[PDB]
């Protein structure tokens, strides 16, 4: 507690069986760790898309420890995560409040020295209006 930092900016968002990664880092290896953390429990047919930049003027956390955070959100089709300065934000549509709590626990274990905004909510929306 009682601190502040000025890290990189980063985000990721999911669309069922496609996930999209947008951001900036000191190296490609930090970007590779974010995709590795989701690959750990990635299912056969889930697409992956990237637009993450590289510049050594920016520095970040390490998603190598965030593998269980993405495990907690595999059943979450609207999931996403964001990072800036000294804060991590986690959002999505969880199957139960036990999953919402478990994403908070996974974020607390991964980032005990940063802010952790568990914006996750329990699923409750499926109106009659499909595409095409």
Curated annotation (Swiss-Prot):
Keyword Zinc assigned:
yes
Highest rank taxon of the organism:
Bacteria
Q: A biological process (GO) annotation for this entry? A: monoatomic ion transport
The role this protein plays is: Probably plays a role in ammonia secretion that neutralizes the medium at pH 5.5, although it does not play a direct role in ammonia transport.
Chain's gene name:
arfA
- What coarse category fits the chief subcellular location reported for this protein? secreted
Q: Cite the entry's keywords alphabetically.
A: Cell outer membrane, Cell wall, Disulfide bond, Ion transport, Membrane, Metal-binding, Secreted, Transmembrane, Transmembrane helix, Transport, Zinc
List the GO terms this entry assigns under cellular component, sorted alphabetically: cell outer membrane; extracellular region
Residues of the BON domain: 55-124
| Upper lineage | Bacteria, Bacillati, Actinomycetota, Actinomycetes, Mycobacteriales
The Gene Ontology terms for molecular function here are: metal ion binding
What family does this chain come from, according to its entry?
A: Belongs to the outer membrane OOP (TC 1.B.6) superfamily. ArfA family.
Q: What is the source species?
A: Mycobacterium tuberculosis (strain CDC 1551 / Oshkosh)
Q: Which residues of the full protein are shown?
A: 73 to 204 of 326
Any keyword Transcription regulation?
A: no
Protein name, entry field:
Peptidoglycan-binding protein ArfA
Q: Where in the cell is it found?
A: Secreted, Cell wall; Cell outer membrane
